[PDB]
Amino acid sequence: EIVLTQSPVTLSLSPGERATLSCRASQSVSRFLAWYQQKPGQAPRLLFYDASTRATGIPARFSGTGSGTDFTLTISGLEPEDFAVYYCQQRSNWPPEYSFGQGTKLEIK
Amino acid sequence: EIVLTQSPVTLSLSPGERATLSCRASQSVSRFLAWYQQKPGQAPRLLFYDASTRATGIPARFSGTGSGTDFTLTISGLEPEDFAVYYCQQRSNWPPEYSFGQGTKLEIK
Amino acid sequence: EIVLTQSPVTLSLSPGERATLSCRASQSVSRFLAWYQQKPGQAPRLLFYDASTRATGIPARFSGTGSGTDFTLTISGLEPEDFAVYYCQQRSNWPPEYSFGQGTKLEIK
Amino acid sequence: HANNSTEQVDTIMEKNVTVTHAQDILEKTHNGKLCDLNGVKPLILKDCSVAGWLLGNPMCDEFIRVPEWSYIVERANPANDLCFPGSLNDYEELKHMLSRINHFEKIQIIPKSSWPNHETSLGVSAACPYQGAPSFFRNVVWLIKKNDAYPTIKISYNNTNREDLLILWGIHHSNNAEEQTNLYKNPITYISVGTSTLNQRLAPKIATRSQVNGQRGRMDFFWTILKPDDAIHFESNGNFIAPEYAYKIVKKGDSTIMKSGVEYGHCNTKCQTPVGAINSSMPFHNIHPLTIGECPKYVKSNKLVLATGLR
Amino acid sequence: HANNSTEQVDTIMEKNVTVTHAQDILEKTHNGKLCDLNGVKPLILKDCSVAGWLLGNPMCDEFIRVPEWSYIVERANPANDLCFPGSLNDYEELKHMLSRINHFEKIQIIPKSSWPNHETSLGVSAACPYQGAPSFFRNVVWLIKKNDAYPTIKISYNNTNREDLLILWGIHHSNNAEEQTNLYKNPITYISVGTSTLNQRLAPKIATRSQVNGQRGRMDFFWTILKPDDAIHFESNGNFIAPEYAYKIVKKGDSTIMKSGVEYGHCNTKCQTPVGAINSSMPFHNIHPLTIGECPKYVKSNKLVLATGLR
Amino acid sequence: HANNSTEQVDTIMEKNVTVTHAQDILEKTHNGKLCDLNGVKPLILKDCSVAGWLLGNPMCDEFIRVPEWSYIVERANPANDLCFPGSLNDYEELKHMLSRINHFEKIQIIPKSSWPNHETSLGVSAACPYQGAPSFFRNVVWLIKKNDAYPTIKISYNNTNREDLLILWGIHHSNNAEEQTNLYKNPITYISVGTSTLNQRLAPKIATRSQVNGQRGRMDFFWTILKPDDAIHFESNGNFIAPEYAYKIVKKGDSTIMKSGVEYGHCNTKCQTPVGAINSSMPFHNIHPLTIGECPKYVKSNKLVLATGLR
Amino acid sequence: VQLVQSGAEVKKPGSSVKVSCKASGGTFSIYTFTWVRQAGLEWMGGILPISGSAKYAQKFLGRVTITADESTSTVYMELSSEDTAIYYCARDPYSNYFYGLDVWGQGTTVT
Amino acid sequence: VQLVQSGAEVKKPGSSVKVSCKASGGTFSIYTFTWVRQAPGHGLEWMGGILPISGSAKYAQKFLGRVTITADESTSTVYMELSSLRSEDTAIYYCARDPYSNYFYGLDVWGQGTTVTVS
Amino acid sequence: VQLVQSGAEVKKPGSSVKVSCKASGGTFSIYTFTWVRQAPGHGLEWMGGILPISGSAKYAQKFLGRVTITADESTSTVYMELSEDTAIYYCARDPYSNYFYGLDVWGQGTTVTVSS
Amino acid sequence: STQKAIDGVTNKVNSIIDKMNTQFEAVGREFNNLERRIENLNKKMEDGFLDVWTYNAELLVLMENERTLDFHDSNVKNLYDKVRLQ
Amino acid sequence: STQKAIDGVTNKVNSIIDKMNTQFEAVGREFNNLERRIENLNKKMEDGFLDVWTYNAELLVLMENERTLDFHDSNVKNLYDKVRLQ
Amino acid sequence: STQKAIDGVTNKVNSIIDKMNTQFEAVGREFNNLERRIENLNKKMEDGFLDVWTYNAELLVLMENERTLDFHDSNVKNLYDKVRLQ
């Protein structure tokens, strides 16, 4: 199995500045890491995938790089719709087994 | 249908010179005509064909060219055996259609 | 058939020299001859074959050339073991017929 | 020396050098019309394939007899072609045997009066009509039962002439069993052909197929070449498409089967490119690389002028 | 003029002349790793062949759905291949059809609910197991008698889509007579397929054929191409390998079916030599004469430096 | 400098320039006789085709055992050839398998004592006589009924030897039903051959043909390759031509099948051309473009001399 | 191929006369035959025997009737009232091109 | 493709719940399906799933003997059977979908979930 | 391949003998076998033999039509029928067909006494 | 004087046919829909031969023009040299 | 001086693929066991085409080097003679 | 000084083989009576390869002779000019 640890749960944030996340691998994950953003109340939602690739629907405001030991997700300009919890995921070999992180929170400063 | 008119029927001549015939065209017939020579008391004989070229057994004394809209039959030197009535012919369409002229007479003086 | 005549039957020498032989021809043999030697009291042997070349087991002391119309056996360096009678042989066309010689004796002095 | 002219040439170093009077070597213009080769007058199959001609398509009766030719001109996507759907076996080999025959001669072999107990006039179809009325190929006979009988056929032909023949026969691929019963009494059928070099046995095929030209059925034809003093033996029990007319060979030379759509006009041409007649003396041409007769070589470059002067 | 350098160049006279600064034309360095082409990611069949992929090899389940690719990469002497001994007919033509197909779509044409009086889950064998348990192919069906009966099969399909399809079926070459009466019931058997431009009839073969992979019997598969508004018809009496999934063609382009052994790593490549990626600009290369994309030309010369400087 | 001599050479400007001492590069002389290659003596099939040697022709007995050779020489339109009319299937793939075998080893498989219920001596024909008496081939056996019986044949072989093998068998194409029922009591007939790679089934053809060599009948032969540790299985109900002798491949190398008419003389040769022996030491030759062993290159011009001097 | 016709006959006007065009010496089934009358020259039309039809003359498109039998090499004509003179016959070879009526008859008079 | 789940139910610990993941709108037999569990204070978890064309399951090495996952490919539905509930497992559960097989893009379509009560 | 022969026997003048050439060692049906006579005052002579596949014999021209030679291919044994005669008779072996190398394999002999 | 060198060789510089006489004449062959490999092979070999020949022709005419210009420069130069020395 | 022509035609010195734009591109076809003759023919013609193009490439690079050195030496010779006469 | 010029490097002049290491060696294949469609192709491609190679060889011999004569007059010229200047 593979265990992941993320950057810390509490991170106050105010509009104008910029916030960035991270979650760290344990043994090795080549390029298998997806993203989610879960606003309180509704089902999990998709975000950037493949740890670098974009997808339809998500605005250009959100971004992030990675594909290696260090994984990142960098915002450009804060918006009043960017408050939720964000997570990590990975996938194993042909018999497919998964594992999830512990999650990171974000709140208005 | 195709209509043809020839040179004037009466044409007297004496040995020692040339003779030339004519035959009209009306609507175009291209190069699908035939010549003839009928002496009194028998069927005619194909003198020239392809509306230009000649066949076997016809003496070299006879000639004649013109395909498009001119039709001629020229002799080099009048011989005592060149006395008969000559005619004009054509053919149209794939399913055989034919039509004949009226005829011309060359007579001794 | 083909008849062959060999060198004089009687020929004596002493060790330390060379001994040569001869086998004639009558019509034509090309290169279809063989060689044998017969020490007294046993089956014949096989010296240089193919009317020229040599076979395995025969020592290098024995030698000989030929083909064409003259045949020889240039046995050089007389050893104390070369006392026997040597003969000639030839072969014919499809299904074949054979014809042997008469033999030649090399004796001691 | 010095003069005045307005030609150009290309060299190894530069490409836009202007030179004096030069000599062009590439011929670019053409007549753009099909004409006659050395007096011999060609064959124009207006809208008809080779198979339709050799089998006798009902709407191709303009070529029942043809004099000596030089080449065969054909059109792409020919409408008439074959009507009752099927195939010609080794059809590409037959079109390779052509372009080597310059003259033909239709000869009558076993006639319509050589089949006493066999019907020969009630074989037609709506796939190949004639002026509304149904029809059928003219060089080949379809045999059907007569008074509820299809007796075995045993016929032979000996090539007494000093020429060779090309014989074409066929098989019928019926759709169902009821159709085969309606046409021929015997369910199981076969055809055998035997020559001094040939040995063939075939059987029909019954299955379910689609609709093309409104016909749910197929046909298959075959061809062979006979020899002087040789003999051909036919034997069949059903689904036989017997021949009536054969083809002689009396001349062998150089020809070419082309594909073009240009009209016919009276000329006297020497080399015939597929798209237009050409007559020139330059040692290089550019139009089309499939020519008949003698004419210069083919290159792709657009400018082959070679300098002769100075400066 | 005079300077200092340590270069060399070959000429007609001498082969060891040392010259000043020159320009290289040949390209030798290469990166030994298979990577992506213009953004699109390739297809890496790890240890499977093409027949195993198309037929659904149990030990090749990793490619049950694949996005758009650029090329197919295979490995020499692949282990999996066809488990059950047999032969795909016209196997070399199918591999030529690919390299012109760049996308696939798996469609369900005949579901398991369309076989009421026919077994479908008892067609396993020890030739192709899965985690020890026996199994069989995934894209085709092996039919077997049910309740001691094998009724005649009559099925059809009309390609309502605007694209073409690939259909795979097969026949069974039983070993002895007892085996055929065990799996099926009718001794004499046939298989028929009929389309607009197809016609085929086949029968099995019973003999002794030694032993391969521990299995003595054999199999034989066939393929076809369908068209819009066309149809396919199947009739059989036994020894039938019916299909489940077909393949749709939705894109055409340039590809290549190459054989290699190099691993996979993430990159961005423009031309893929089958032993190593290359990204260069000079107009000549030397690695391997089978490239996909846009590479310079291939020469066998070990050195192709052409001088530019003086002396 | 200046001298005197009477040579000539050709250049781009002029074709009749006379130059001083030059060096010739083309070979124009040849020995015109067939001789040995590096001491290895060739094989001269005087008047005998390959089909008559491999099968065994009664009037080809001179090659019942041959040593190691270098090349096979054959004469045009060979008279002896194969007597009983027929055909060896894939006759031209076999002649490509040859020119890679440099040695043969005749072996005795399935001896004459392995048939207790089938005759093997009354299988003669008048088309292949020996010294005025009827005979047949020597490497195969034509089985006929014995005591009014033709029981089914079930035989097998296992290639225990390291070297491979070449097995030849055949079929009989009878003329009518009476002939078949005379030779073999069973009307319906089949033969089956099964190996680890080959699978085959065949049936005869009964029809009427012409007279070739006075024989109204045909026979067909086949061939295969067997690998070490594998097996071959035969099974037949009639029309069988069982084998007796096989061929063991012991050496592989470079050879050449050539067609010629020159006689045999004793020499030593290295560059044997179809029409003449060659022993030269110059790069270019002009005689014939199908050589064996080390040889100079081939061109078609006649004046390849290149000048070396001045003036 | 030599051509000879039927003969001569005299009948009342308005009736029909069957004039023949018998020939021999080749394959008659792929040859074009016409009719020429002289009551200059005139035309009626004929029949290609392998097709089984006719192309009648537009001058009298309902006048004549032409038929041919391909087992005896004979062509018929039905002329069903100043016709008091001769009727000839002719033949031109080849189909896709026209050369000319090379083989002509001898004549047939009906009064 | 829509992946509306089954519904909601309440049952005391120790028992088993059959949470269903219904879907429609394509070929269900070549797709990847998994489960994500969310106890209140337990972030995101995972169990495993089934590929419906093979007939096996790749369970979770954390609790490899916990759950049982099966699929029916004739009605486009997936199951799950976790037994011996405790007081810890009380909150909602989720189902998901992942396309393609030889590559991992991401769990694209998720749904809305199923809520349970344990006491 | 090894060659062994019959042995010795004595018979009165005019009769025949049946000397054999028993052998073993491989394919015996594609080899050339002949006979050589070594009467005391006769040097080396020849009589002929048989190729076993063909089934014939090329008899000598000195004693034309004298002896009879036959061979059986199921037991690897050649025969000879010979019906001044006191002589020993050898057996030989010539490999290959289209070329002549030599009578490589030789026997050991067989003596026949005639006397009176 | 030019008649001795260039005007007398006009028949040779023109009508290059004497060296480019054996060219690959294209012959049309037809194949069905189950012999695609052979038809593809025929297409590529014909195109390759045509490409080789046009390459040769263009290269040949290029050097012919270059040597012709160099020839004119050379003989006018040496003629100037000799008339200046004399 | 040299930049007027040599450094200006350096685009022609490189980019040799301007004339070698269409080269025989090797493609892979696979034949089965019983089609040895056709596969043998394919192999031999492919190798022949590759060898022809290799010969062409080597020959042109040789001529380009030769003519380049010739250009340099003739150039410096003509500048030498003009500056000597001036 | 011809030993330094050409006489000591006559080996290369007679070693034309180094360029013709690989020439299309004709191989013997035949075809039956119903397969003249590729036998024809085989014949034409073999003839084309032979024609290409003989054209190459002849044209190469032509440049070699022309360059040899040019080289010889080059030597006569340059020794002429050194003996003139000295």
Side-chain angles (χ1 to χ4, degrees), chain F residues 26 285-286 298-302 304, chain J residues 22, chain L residues 47 50-51 54:
Chain F
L26 201 38
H285 92 88
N286 181 63
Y298 181 87
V299 308
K300 295 198 287 185
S301 192
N302 306 301
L304 271 283
Chain J
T22 49
Chain L
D47 300 359
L50 290 184
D51 265 307
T54 166

Side-chain angles (χ1 to χ4, degrees), chain F residues 75-121:
Chain F
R75 262 62 151 148
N77 47 59
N80 265 15
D81 207 292
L82 169 163
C83 39
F84 214 83
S87 64
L88 184 76
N89 181 25
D90 308 295
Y91 176 63
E92 305 228 8
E93 283 100 303
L94 194 48
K95 312 214 308 205
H96 187 91
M97 217 207 57
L98 292 169
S99 88
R100 300 292 330 258
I101 276 163
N102 247 327
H103 204 105
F104 266 131
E105 227 77 66
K106 289 204 61 43
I107 199 188
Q108 216 291 131
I109 85 167
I110 311 200
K112 201 81 81 63
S113 309
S114 48
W115 314 110
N117 291 33
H118 288 134
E119 198 99 52
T120 178
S121 74

Side-chain angles (χ1 to χ4, degrees), chain F residues 13-304:
Chain F
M13 283 317 149
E14 266 295 328
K15 306 294 296 293
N16 275 301
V17 178
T18 89
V19 81
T20 181
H21 65 292
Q23 202 280 330
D24 228 13
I25 220 65
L26 201 38
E27 175 51 85
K28 308 155 178 277
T29 82
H30 71 88
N31 186 26
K33 194 156 58 184
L34 286 159
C35 316
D36 321 328
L37 253 171
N38 278 320
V40 191
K41 293 165 21 184
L43 178 52
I44 305 300
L45 299 204
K46 298 158 10 195
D47 39 349
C48 264
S49 72
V50 185
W53 170 38
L54 264 43
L55 272 309
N57 207 17
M59 314 206 59
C60 209
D61 250 8
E62 233 169 23
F63 314 97
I64 214 78
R65 153 162 189 89
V66 81
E68 181 176 0
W69 68 82
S70 202
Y71 52 105
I72 307 189
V73 164
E74 199 179 88
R75 262 62 151 148
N77 47 59
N80 265 15
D81 207 292
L82 169 163
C83 39
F84 214 83
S87 64
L88 184 76
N89 181 25
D90 308 295
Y91 176 63
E92 305 228 8
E93 283 100 303
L94 194 48
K95 312 214 308 205
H96 187 91
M97 217 207 57
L98 292 169
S99 88
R100 300 292 330 258
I101 276 163
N102 247 327
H103 204 105
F104 266 131
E105 227 77 66
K106 289 204 61 43
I107 199 188
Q108 216 291 131
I109 85 167
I110 311 200
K112 201 81 81 63
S113 309
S114 48
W115 314 110
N117 291 33
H118 288 134
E119 198 99 52
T120 178
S121 74
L122 330 180
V124 280
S125 83
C128 324
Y130 192 50
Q131 315 271 68
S135 267
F136 202 53
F137 306 94
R138 311 216 175 268
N139 284 185
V140 315
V141 164
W142 169 350
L143 253 70
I144 323 187
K145 85 184 181 185
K146 163 208 164 64
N147 295 104
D148 172 353
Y150 200 108
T152 325
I153 279 297
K154 327 201 52 58
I155 218 77
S156 41
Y157 196 77
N158 178 217
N159 180 22
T160 83
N161 311 96
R162 159 57 43 75
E163 291 99 332
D164 318 277
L165 274 173
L166 171 76
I167 311 109
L168 269 88
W169 71 102
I171 197 181
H172 187 225
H173 279 316
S174 209
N175 198 55
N176 330 119
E178 201 271 334
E179 227 187 350
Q180 184 129 309
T181 206
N182 261 3
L183 311 187
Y184 329 106
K185 80 169 327 160
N186 322 93
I188 311 118
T189 294
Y190 70 94
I191 323 164
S192 309
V193 184
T195 83
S196 317
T197 286
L198 183 97
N199 184 10
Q200 214 190 53
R201 164 149 310 214
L202 283 154
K205 274 161 176 180
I206 306 182
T208 166
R209 304 162 207 87
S210 322
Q211 187 144 223
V212 197
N213 295 342
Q215 271 339 293
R216 189 170 325 263
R218 310 281 177 290
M219 312 206 316
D220 265 299
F221 296 117
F222 304 92
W223 60 278
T224 196
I225 277 160
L226 206 66
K227 289 303 185 334
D229 213 6
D230 322 68
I232 179 140
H233 308 70
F234 294 109
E235 191 189 2
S236 158
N237 204 355
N239 292 75
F240 194 29
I241 314 287
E244 205 171 349
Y245 277 84
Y247 287 84
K248 268 206 319 172
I249 310 108
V250 184
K251 183 176 313 303
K252 269 193 205 353
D254 185 25
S255 320
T256 281
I257 316 199
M258 91 165 58
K259 279 214 62 34
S260 209
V262 188
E263 78 269 15
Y264 181 31
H266 37 270
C267 326
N268 209 66
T269 47
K270 332 190 47 58
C271 185
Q272 196 44 67
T273 70
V275 302
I278 291 267
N279 58 314
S280 314
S281 65
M282 308 157 325
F284 283 123
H285 92 88
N286 181 63
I287 293 101
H288 214 278
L290 296 111
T291 88
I292 168 68
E294 57 97 358
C295 276
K297 302 310 189 187
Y298 181 87
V299 308
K300 295 198 287 185
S301 192
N302 306 301
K303 231 267 193 190
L304 271 283

Side-chain angles (χ1 to χ4, degrees), chain D residues 202-224:
Chain D
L202 296 160
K205 279 188 229 152
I206 280 141
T208 309
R209 265 153 313 217
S210 317
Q211 208 164 287
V212 83
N213 299 356
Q215 277 312 339
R216 189 157 332 245
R218 305 285 176 289
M219 280 210 205
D220 260 3
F221 303 113
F222 300 94
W223 61 280
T224 190

Side-chain angles (χ1 to χ4, degrees), chain I residues 2 6 11 18 27 58 75 91-93 95 98 108 111:
Chain I
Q2 308 282 351
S6 183
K11 275 141 172 285
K18 290 198 69 86
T27 37
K58 183 80 171 74
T75 44
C91 196
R93 202 287 289 252
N98 71 312
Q108 34 86 15
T111 166

